Structures are given as structure tokens and as C-alpha cells.
Amino acid sequence: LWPWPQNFQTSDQRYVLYPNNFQFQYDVSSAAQPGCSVLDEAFQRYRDLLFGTLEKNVLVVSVVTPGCNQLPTLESVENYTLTINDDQCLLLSETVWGALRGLETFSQLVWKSAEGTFFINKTEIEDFPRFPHRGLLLDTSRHYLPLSSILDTLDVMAYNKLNVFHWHLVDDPSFPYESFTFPELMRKGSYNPVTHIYTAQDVKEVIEYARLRGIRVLAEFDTPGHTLSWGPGIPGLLTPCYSGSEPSGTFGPVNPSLNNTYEFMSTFFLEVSSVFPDFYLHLGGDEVDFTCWKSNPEIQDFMRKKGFGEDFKQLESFYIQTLLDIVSSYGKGYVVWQEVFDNKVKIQPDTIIQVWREDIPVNYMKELELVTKAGFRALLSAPWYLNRISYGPDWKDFYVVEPLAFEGTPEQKALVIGGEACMWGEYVDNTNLVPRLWPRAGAVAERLWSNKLTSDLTFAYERLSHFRCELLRRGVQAQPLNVGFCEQEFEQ
Amino acid sequence: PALWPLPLSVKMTPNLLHLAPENFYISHSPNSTAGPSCTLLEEAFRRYHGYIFGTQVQQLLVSITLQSECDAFPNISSDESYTLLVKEPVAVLKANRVWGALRGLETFSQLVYQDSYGTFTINESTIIDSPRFSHRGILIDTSRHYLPVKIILKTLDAMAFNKFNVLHWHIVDDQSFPYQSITFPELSNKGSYSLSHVYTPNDVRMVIEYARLRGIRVLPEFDTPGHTLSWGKGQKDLLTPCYSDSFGPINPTLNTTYSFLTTFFKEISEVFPDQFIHLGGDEVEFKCWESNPKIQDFMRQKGFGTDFKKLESFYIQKVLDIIATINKGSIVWQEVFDDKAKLAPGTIVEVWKDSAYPEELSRVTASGFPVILSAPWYLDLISYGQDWRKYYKVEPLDFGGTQKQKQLFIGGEACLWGEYVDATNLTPRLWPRASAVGERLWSSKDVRDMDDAYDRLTRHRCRMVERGIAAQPLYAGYCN
Numbered sequence: 001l002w003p004w005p006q007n008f009q010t011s012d013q014r015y016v017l018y019p020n021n022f023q024f025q026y027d028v029s030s031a032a033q034p035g036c037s038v039l040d041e042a043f044q045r046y047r048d049l050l051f052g053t054l055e056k057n058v059l060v061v062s063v064v065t066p067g068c069n070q071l072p073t074l075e076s077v078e079n080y081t082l083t084i085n086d087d088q089c090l091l092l093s094e095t096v097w098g099a100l101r102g103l104e105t106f107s108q109l110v111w112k113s114a115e116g117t118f119f120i121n122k123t124e125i126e127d128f129p130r131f132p133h134r135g136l137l138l139d140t141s142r143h144y145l146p147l148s149s150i151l152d153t154l155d156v157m158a159y160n161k162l163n164v165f166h167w168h169l170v171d172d173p174s175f176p177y178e179s180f181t182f183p184e185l186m187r188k189g190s191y192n193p194v195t196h197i198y199t200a201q202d203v204k205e206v207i208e209y210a211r212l213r214g215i216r217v218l219a220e221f222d223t224p225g226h227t228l229s230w231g232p233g234i235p236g237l238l239t240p241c242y243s244g245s246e247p248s249g250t251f252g253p254v255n256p257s258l259n260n261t262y263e264f265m266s267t268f269f270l271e272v273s274s275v276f277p278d279f280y281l282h283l284g285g286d287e288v289d290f291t292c293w294k295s296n297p298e299i300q301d302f303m304r305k306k307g308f309g310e311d312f313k314q315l316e317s318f319y320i321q322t323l324l325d326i327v328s329s330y331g332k333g334y335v336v337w338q339e340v341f342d343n344k345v346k347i348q349p350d351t352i353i354q355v356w357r358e359d360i361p362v363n364y365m366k367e368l369e370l371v372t373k374a375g376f377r378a379l380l381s382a383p384w385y386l387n388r389i390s391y392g393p394d395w396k397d398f399y400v401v402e403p404l405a406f407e408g409t410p411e412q413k414a415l416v417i418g419g420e421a422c423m424w425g426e427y428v429d430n431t432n433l434v435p436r437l438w439p440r441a442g443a444v445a446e447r448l449w450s451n452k453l454t455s456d457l458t459f460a461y462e463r464l465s466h467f468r469c470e471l472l473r474r475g476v477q478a479q480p481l482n483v484g485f486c487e488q489e490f491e492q
Numbered sequence: 493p494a495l496w497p498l499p500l501s502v503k504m505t506p507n508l509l510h511l512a513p514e515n516f517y518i519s520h521s522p523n524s525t526a527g528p529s530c531t532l533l534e535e536a537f538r539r540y541h542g543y544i545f546g547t548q549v550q551q552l553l554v555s556i557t558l559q560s561e562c563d564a565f566p567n568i569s570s571d572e573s574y575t576l577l578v579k580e581p582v583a584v585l586k587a588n589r590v591w592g593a594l595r596g597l598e599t600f601s602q603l604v605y606q607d608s609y610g611t612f613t614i615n616e617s618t619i620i621d622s623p624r625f626s627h628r629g630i631l632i633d634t635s636r637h638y639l640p641v642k643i644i645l646k647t648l649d650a651m652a653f654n655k656f657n658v659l660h661w662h663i664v665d666d667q668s669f670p671y672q673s674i675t676f677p678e679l680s681n682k683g684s685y686s687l688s689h690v691y692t693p694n695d696v697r698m699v700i701e702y703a704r705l706r707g708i709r710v711l712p713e714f715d716t717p718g719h720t721l722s723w724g725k726g727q728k729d730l731l732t733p734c735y736s737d738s739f740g741p742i743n744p745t746l747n748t749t750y751s752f753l754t755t756f757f758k759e760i761s762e763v764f765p766d767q768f769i770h771l772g773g774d775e776v777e778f779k780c781w782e783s784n785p786k787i788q789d790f791m792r793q794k795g796f797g798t799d800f801k802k803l804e805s806f807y808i809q810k811v812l813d814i815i816a817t818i819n820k821g822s823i824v825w826q827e828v829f830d831d832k833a834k835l836a837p838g839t840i841v842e843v844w845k846d847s848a849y850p851e852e853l854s855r856v857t858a859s860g861f862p863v864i865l866s867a868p869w870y871l872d873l874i875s876y877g878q879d880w881r882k883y884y885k886v887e888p889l890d891f892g893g894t895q896k897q898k899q900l901f902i903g904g905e906a907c908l909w910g911e912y913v914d915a916t917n918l919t920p921r922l923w924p925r926a927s928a929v930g931e932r933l934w935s936s937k938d939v940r941d942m943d944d945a946y947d948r949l950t951r952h953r954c955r956m957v958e959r960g961i962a963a964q965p966l967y968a969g970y971c972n
């Protein structure tokens with residue numbers, strides 16, 4: 001089992017399963033019934049994974065009705081109970097998304113002996129996630145990622161019970177997103193206007209694919225920093241840096257002193273809010289350099305009119321405030337990096353802050369304290385930067401992290417809604433994504449789902465390594481934790 | 493030009509020459525010592541005709557000067573030198589041996605490209621090239637993690653593109669014994685992870701002949717007396733029992749040990765056609781030997797006192813003779829040399845420790861023994877960023893010694909120990925970080941420009957990806 005359930009009562013009493021004659025059926029009592037897109041496909045997908053006294057059936061009953069066509073939200077309940085004994089074999093979930101979790105848990109409990117016989121132990125489970133926001137970040141800018149690689153990642157996120165896909169579509173070196181409101185962004189920003197592109201068809205497939213797995217799609221079009229690929233296509237958007245008197249070629253962050261800029265963002269983010277159905281959008285706001293703005297004389301003049309002065313922290317605030325209003329008018333929530341909070345930017349009470357920095361300006365645990373005491377919600381990602389590789393089993397570092405290990409009151413700590421693992425693509429693409437992702441990302445997966453008390457490294461290794469071999473069986477190219485072997489070694 | 497490694501001498505001219513897929517031929521020169529009867533070249537011609545494609549130059553004539561050595565196995569003294577001439581209407585590739593022709597064909601394929609319209613083109617030029625060092629290898633660990641034959645063969649293809657010529661096969665170790673022995677079938681039957689995780693005679697034969705066709709030597713290593721916890725599964729009383737219940741290294745007091753090794757290494761001498769055989773002899777712990785009453789007696793009857801370095805030297809010299817008896821060379825880790833053991837003339841030493849390794853190189857060369865470097869190139873020890881620069885900056889001949897001692901330095905190896913490496917992450921983690929070592933061991937000493945290195949390595953990396961090698965990127969960018 002991975003991740004480890006909140007309440008799992010095991011036994012040694014076993015039952016025999018039948019690969020072919022095993023079927024998933026709804027209970028007449030259930031809210032979700034034949035026609036439930038999510039579960040119909042789930043039953044099919046899981047029977048392929050498993051089989052691609054005795055038990056022939058598995059009853060699935062959802063109490064909360066809310067269809068199977070509407071996408072998951074931050075408020076969605078993932079509670080479920082797995083009851084398997086002599087009398088019954090029932091999977092009782094509160095919602096449709098809890099059933100998905102239940103099926104995954106069920107899939108890992110199915111085992112086979114040295115004879116090859118399929119079995120299933122007498123089990124009683126009462127499970128639920130510790131945090132509602134369990135995400136994983138992919139950087140499709142520094143290196144383009146084929147649609148197949150993204151869909152594969154979503155398949156494994158489902159195995160680890162991760163429910164948020166932090167899509168970092170664009171950045172400095174590449175703009176692979178194809179915009180229909182501004183077609184020049186993709187045509188002159190992407191590495192290649194044809195082969196390395198994300199169409200409207202690609203995006204809607206990701207969303208629906210993720211939806212079937214009960215995964216939210218958090219889109220991030222980082223602004224005003226990390227926007228070098230925006231330059232060409234939409235002229236005048238970026239800030240032309242200065243040497244002193246005349247401009248010297250290089251461009252900086254988005255120019256917040258032009259009317260053209262705000263009418264562009266209003267039109268562009270209208271599309272973004274239309275394409276991505278999720279309630280929240282990530283607006284970035286990280287690593288914003290004030291150097292290029294200060295050097296520019298035309299921008300220096302702008303701050304004297306509005307009366308900001310010498311601090312660009314409130315100049316940045318002016319940009320983000322306006323940007324938040326635009327996105328807020330479309331009925332969209334928003335997540336933002338920690339810089340926005342650190343730079344005292346006028347911010348809406350419902351904004352979520354994502355802690356990513358380790359030491360500067362303050363320790364990441366001290367950050368969660370400030371953000372929560374300030375009243376805002378927070379995501380933790382600081383110690384979960386998978387892109388930062390090191391020798392040995394650093395998954396133990398990720399696993400031992402305690403998100404609520406800071407100074408605060410019960411309700412203050414309740415503002416922490418989870419976190420995300422981050423795979424920045426500076427040194428990662430289609431060639432080494434999977435092995436570098438899993439099963440290191442599984443360490444974060446369990447820490448965000450399981451209970452505070454599940455922390456034994458020895459117990460973690462046993463299950464994670466066992467889960468690692470299972471991943472390989474499912475076709476996942478996951479790297480080894482340490483010396484050892486899987487009977488079915490990876491070979492494709 | 494996206495050449496890697498960078499040849500000794502390159503004379504490029506802005507004159508374009510076009511090629512035609514179903515019209516370009518690679519055949520032997522009328523006055524060559526090698527002809528259509530040479531299987532190695534025949535295979536290399538068809539193989540590179542696929543890499544190249546998949547004012548007109550119509551044919552590439554391959555002329556072998558000296559005795560080709562077409563059907564022979566490559567050794568440390570092989571001649572990989574070659575000269576290339578790109579001109580119309582006949583391109584000329586001339587080399588002394590067949591080994592140079594292979595390296596030349598690789599270089600020639602790296603010169604052909606497609607222009608803006610897809611037209612196969614190549615700037616006419618003149619290239620004279622030869623390896624700075626003769627021993628350029630890659631170490632793979634198939635014991636800590638079993639590696640399917642396919643990935644080993646792919647590693648060989650990748651080594652061919654990067655001009656490596658030695659495959660240091662660290663086949664067995666503590667964790668497992670995947671090598672299937674003909675004389676002692678119990679070693680693999682009880683010492684391997686499982687029976688499916690085993691290298692049968694034919695699997696080994698396939699690796700060797702696949703490597704030969706590409707000019708790669710297969711250097712086997714059966715580490716002794718340390719790193720042998722798996723050896724004591726199918727062989728009783730071979731390992732030292734630890735009293736005071738685990739086991740230790742191989743017992744060097746019993747005559748059963750040396751009788752076993754003799755028949756074992758006699759098999760190895762006929763399985764692996766390479767002259768040299770790595771014996772290991774590293775990280776040997778004396779903890780267990782020191783706590784064995786029977787062994788402490790062997791210390792008296794020989795008068796070694798309490799210095800087990802002599803008991804270590806006693807064992808390794810016994811093994812060295814066995815290898816010398818069967819007309820084979822020997823390679824060994826630095827511990828053995830440091831343990832004051834007596835090595836035969838021609839014995840190779842491999843330096844692998846960080847702590848003052850240039851000083852080790854000095855000591856080994858001073859004693860008149862050939863040396864190989866691997867200390868700074870432990871690729872298994874990964875880190876964040878472009879660490880390929882750290883490996884590229886390394887200069888091997890930077891140690892105290894005469895000009896006569898520098899000739900004893902024959903090359904180095906990039907090691908990828910498998911404590912955390914298997915088929916899932918080997919290729920990406922190995923390349924193109926090992927490519928940095930390849931150029932440092934083939935190209936001239938004065939080839940150290942970073943901007944140019946980075947420029948050519950990114951484009952060469954994309955070439956490996958197109959050839960089926962999943963090499964990871966150096967930084968942000970794209971291929972195709």
C-alpha cells in the first residue's frame with residue numbers, strides 16, 4: 001500500500017480471486033450508476049492493470065451524487081472505506097473521487113503467491129487525505145514534453161493519489177502554448193511552431209484525461225517575470241533594459257507602465273480562464289528582477305506620476321493588483337509564489353501563497369508561520385524540489401518533512417492546504433523525466449495524504465520499494481531506491 | 493561542425509558537396525590490405541550508411557594501409573589512427589589498421605548534414621586524427637543491479653559514437669553473482685538475484701562479438717578477495733567465517749581457494765578473449781580475518797605478525813601468477829599497489845581515490861608500472877547542474893614525474909556503479925556526461941574551450957538521441 005491509509009486494519013485471512021470472472025458492480029443503493037464516465041472507465045482501466053473462500057465481485061457505492069462529468073475541486077471530499085470479509089466486499093466512498101482512491105488502494109492489496117494464485121486479504125479500511133491539495137509540477141518550457149509524457153505522468157499521479165497537476169506551460173526560453181487570441185505568441189516564442197507545440201486539442205485532452213483520474217489542472221502563465229519568450233510576437237510587452245542613456249538590446253520583465261500591457265493581459269487571461277475550467281489559476285510572480293525596470297527612464301517617470309518613489313515592490317504590486325482584478329472578474333481564484341507575499345503586495349484575502357524558497361528571506365517553516373498568521377492559505381514546495389538531484393536516497397529527505405512543524409494555533413495551522421513536488425525542466429525532458437520523478441515523488445505523495453504519525457523510514461522503504469516494483473509491472477520507468485531487484489525487471 | 497570528440501587536426505573549407513542516398517557507396521580501395529572478404533568492414537559500411545542518411549560525392553573509398561587485423565580482437569596496442577579527405581568525386585578514408593577505419597567512419601558520419609531544404613551536404617575538408625590515450629573505457633555494474641543484454645549493447649553503440657574502446661565489465665560483487673560459470677554452475681544458481689537474472693555463456697559471447705565489430709574491448713572484472721559475499725553461496729568454505737553470524741572476504745589460507753581460482757580463471761581466459769583481466773582487490777576489510785583463530789595460525793607459519801597487508805599481498809600475488817601462467821595481463825585497483833604487493837612487469841594499476849590522486853599517479857609511474865585513472869570520473873555520484881564541466885576540466889597528465897613516466901599513463905575510465913543504477917536510469921545518467929570524458933581522453937590537451945565544448949556537445953547529444961540513445965540534456969533547449 002502506497003500511500004499508507006489513515007485507518008488500515010489488516011489480517012491473514014485470504015480469499016481467491018478470478019482474473020476473468022472478476023467484475024466491478026454498482027450498488028442499487030449508490031448515487032453513481034452505470035453512465036458514470038469516471039467509474040465506467042476506472043473499472044475498465046483497473047481490470048487491465050490487475051488482470052491485463054473466494055471473491056467474484058466488488059460493490060462500489062457512492063453516497064454523494066454530484067455526477068461524473070463535473071471536474072474535481074479543492075472542496076471535493078475524498079473519504080472512502082474498504083470493507084472486505086466473508087460476508088461482504090464493499091467499497092464505500094463519500095464522493096466519486098473517493099472511489100477512484102479506493103480502487104487504487106484495492107489494486108495494490110491484490111497479490112499473488114509463488115503458485116501464481118491471485119488473492120485478497122481480509123481488510124477493513126477507513127481512509128482520507130490529510131491535505132486536499134496534493135500536487136506535482138511539470139516545466140514544459142525549459143524543455144518541451146510530448147503529450148504522451150504528460151498523460152503518462154498523470155497515470156502515475158493517480159497511483160500515488162496526487163490530485164493537482166501544476167502545469168508550468170511557459171517561461172523564458174519557450175512558449176509552447178498555442179493562443180488563439182494572440183497567435184504570434186506561439187509562432188515566434190516556441191522552439192518550433194509545429195513539433196514542439198500545445199494545441200487547443202492537446203490542452204482539452206490533458207484536462208479531460210486528468211479529470212478521469214480525479215486530477216485538477218492548475219495552469220500557470222508566469223508573469224511578470226519569466227517572460228522572455230513572450231517578447232517576440234507581442235511587441236512592446238517586455239521592458240527594454242538600459243545601460244544608462246540608450247537601450248542595449250536585452251529585455252527584462254513585463255512592462256507595467258504601458259496601457260498596451262494591461263489590455264493584452266485582460267484579453268489573454270480571458271482565454272486562459274475559458275480554456276482551463278479549474279476555479280484556481282497560478283499567476284506566478286516569482287524571481288521578479290527590479291534591475292531592468294530601474295534602468296529604464298520611461299518607467300522611472302511612471303513611478304513619479306503614481307507616487308511610488310524608489311521601491312519597485314509596490315510598483316510590482318500595481319501590476320499584480322490589476323492582474324488579480326482581471327482574473328477575479330472572470331470568477332477565478334488564484335495561487336501565487338511567495339515573493340508576492342514577501343514583497344508586501346496588496347493582496348486579496350482569498351489568495352493562496354506557495355512557499356518555495358529555503359533560506360532567503362526566512363526559513364520555509366518560518367514562512368508558513370508568517371503566511372498563516374497573516375490569514376492566507378499556504379502550499380509547501382520548498383523542500384520538495386525534485387529537480388535538485390543528489391547522490392543516494394534523498395527520498396528520505398522528502399519523506400521526513402513535516403508541513404505543520406511551526407509556531408501557530410490549531411485554526412492557524414489549518415490554513416495549510418498541502419503542497420506540490422516540483423520538477424523544473426532545466427535539465428529534464430522526455431529522456432529522463434520518469435526515472436527522476438518516480439518513486440522520489442511518492443515520498444511527497446504519502447506525506448501529503450497519510451497521517452502525521454506515519455513516519456518510520458524502515459516501514460516507508462519496505463512499502464515504497466514494493467510499490468516501485470509494482471510501478472515497473474505497470475510499465476513505469478521508475479528508478480531503484482537502492483541495491484536490489486524486481487523479478488520483472490524493466491525492459492522496453 | 494558538430495564533431496565529438498574533436499579530431500587532432502581539422503581543415504574546413506566553405507566548399508559544399510552533396511550526397512545521394514541510393515547512389516552513395518562505401519567500398520575498399522583497389523590497393524587495400526582489406527577487401528569484401530572482411531566481415532568487420534562490410535558490417536561497418538552498411539551500418540554507417542544508415543547513420544549518415546537515416547559538387548557530388550559519389551563514393552567513399554576505405555583504404556587500409558598495414559595488415560588490417562580484420563578478424564582479430566582489439567588490444568591495448570591497437571592503432572586507431574586515421575586520415576580523412578572529403579573531395580569530389582571521391583572521398584578518401586585511409587588508415588593503418590581496421591580500428592582507424594571505424595573511428596574514421598564515425599567522424600565521417602558526423603560531417604554529413606542536411607541543409608535548409610533537406611539536401612544531404614558536407615563541407616569538403618581534410619582531417620588527420622589519432623587518440624591521445626589508448627585506454628578509454630566505461631565501467632558498468634551488473635551485480636548491484638542486473639542489466640538486460642539490450643542496454644549493454646546500446647551502451648556499446650553509445651561508446652562507439654563517443655569513441656570509447658574498453659568496456660570495464662564489473663560483472664559480479666557482494667549483492668549478486670549473475671555470471672553463469674561452466675565449470676562451477678553453482679556460483680550463479682545460488683548467488684544470483686534469481687535464475688532469470690543471469691548472464692549465460694551465449695549472452696557473454698554476444699556482448700564480446702558486438703563490441704569487437706565496433707572496436708571495443710571487453711575487460712572483465714571478478715573482484716577478489718573483497719566484494720565476494722555472493723561467491724560464498726555456491727562455493728562452500730570459500731569465504732572467511734566471521735567469529736565473535738556473517739562472513740568476510742575470500743579465505744587466503746586454504747589450498748582449496750587457489751585450486752578453485754585456477755580452474756575459475758582458466759575458464760575466464762577462454763571466455764574473454766582480451767589479454768587483461770581485472771582482479772579487483774579493493775575495499776578489503778581485515779575485520780573478519782583478524783577474528784579467526786585458524787587464520788591467525790597462518791600468520792605465524794609465515795611470520796606476517798599482525799600486518800594483514802602482507803596476507804593481502806600474499807593472496808593477490810598468488811592470483812597474479814595464475815593470470816601470468818595462462819599468458820594473460822592483469823589490472824588491479826590501487827589498494828593492492830599501496831599494500832606493498834609485488835606486481836609483474838606490465839601489470840596495470842587503476843587509481844580511484846580522490847585524496848591526492850595525482851600523487852598516486854606519481855608513485856605508480858615512478859615504480860615503472862602502467863597506470864589508469866578513474867578517481868575524478870565517478871559518474872554514479874550525481875549532482876545538480878552541468879557537472880559534465882567538472883569532468884571535462886580534468887587534466888590527467890597533471891602530476892609530478894619525468895617525461896618517461898608520462899608514457900606509462902595509458903588512459904582512464906568513467907565509472908557508473910549501480911547501487912542506484914539499473915536499466916531504468918543508466919543511459920540518461922551515463923550520457924552525455926561520459927562524452928566529456930571521451931573528448932578529454934581522445935582529443936588534444938589544448939582542447940579546453942568551454943563555449944565551443946558546450947556548443948558541440950549539445951548538438952552531439954541531439955545526434956545520440958536521433959541514433960536511439962536516450963542522453964539527457966545539458967541545459968534548456970531542444971533537438972530536431
Ligand SMILES: *[C@@H]1O[C@H](CO)[C@@H](O[C@@H]2O[C@H](CO)[C@@H](O[C@@H]3O[C@H](CO)[C@@H](O)[C@H](O)[C@@H]3O)[C@H](O)[C@H]2NC(C)=O)[C@H](O)[C@H]1NC(C)=O
Binds near residue numbers: 010011012014
Ligand atoms: C495477506 O495474508 C497473507 C497470508 O494469508 C500474508 O502473507 C504472509 O506474509 C508473511 C510476511 O512476509 C510471510 O511470512 C514470512 O515467512 C518467512 C519464513 O517462511 C519468514 O522468514 C519471514 O520473515 C516472513 O515472516 C508468510 O509466508 C505469508 N503467508 C503466511 C502463511 O503467513 C500477508 O502478510 C498478508 N498481507 C498483508 C501484508 O496484510
Ligand SMILES: *[C@@H]1O[C@H](CO)[C@@H](O[C@@H]2O[C@H](CO)[C@@H](O[C@@H]3O[C@H](CO)[C@@H](O)[C@H](O)[C@@H]3O)[C@H](O)[C@H]2NC(C)=O)[C@H](O)[C@H]1NC(C)=O
Binds near residue numbers: 077128
Ligand atoms: C471525511 O473525513 C473527515 C476526517 O475523517 C471528516 O471530518 C471530520 O469529521 C469528524 C466526525 O464528523 C469530526 O469530528 C468531530 O469533531 C468535533 C469538534 O469539531 C467534535 O465535537 C465531535 O465529537 C467529533 O469528534 C472532525 O472535526 C472532522 N474534521 C477532521 C478533518 O477530522 C469528514 O466529515 C469526512 N467527510 C464526510 C462528508 O463524511
Ligand SMILES: *[C@H]1O[C@H](CO)[C@@H](O[C@@H]2O[C@H](CO)[C@@H](O[C@@H]3O[C@H](CO)[C@@H](O)[C@H](O)[C@@H]3O)[C@H](O)[C@H]2NC(C)=O)[C@H](O)[C@H]1NC(C)=O
Binds near residue numbers: 493505507508
Ligand atoms: C560550411 O561551414 C562553414 C563554416 O562553418 C559555413 O560558413 C558560414 O556561412 C554562413 C552563411 O553565410 C556565414 O554566416 C554569415 O555571418 C555573417 C556575419 O559574419 C552574417 O552577416 C551573414 O548574414 C551570414 O549569416 C558564416 O560566417 C560562415 N561560417 C560560420 C562560422 O558559420 C557554411 O555553412 C558551409 N560552407 C558554405 C559557405 O556554404
Ligand SMILES: *[C@@H]1O[C@H](CO)[C@@H](O)[C@H](O)[C@H]1NC(C)=O
Binds near residue numbers: 259
Ligand atoms: C487604455 O486606453 C484605452 C483607450 O482609451 C482605454 O479604453 C482604457 O481604459 C485604458 N486602460 C487603462 C485605464 O489602463
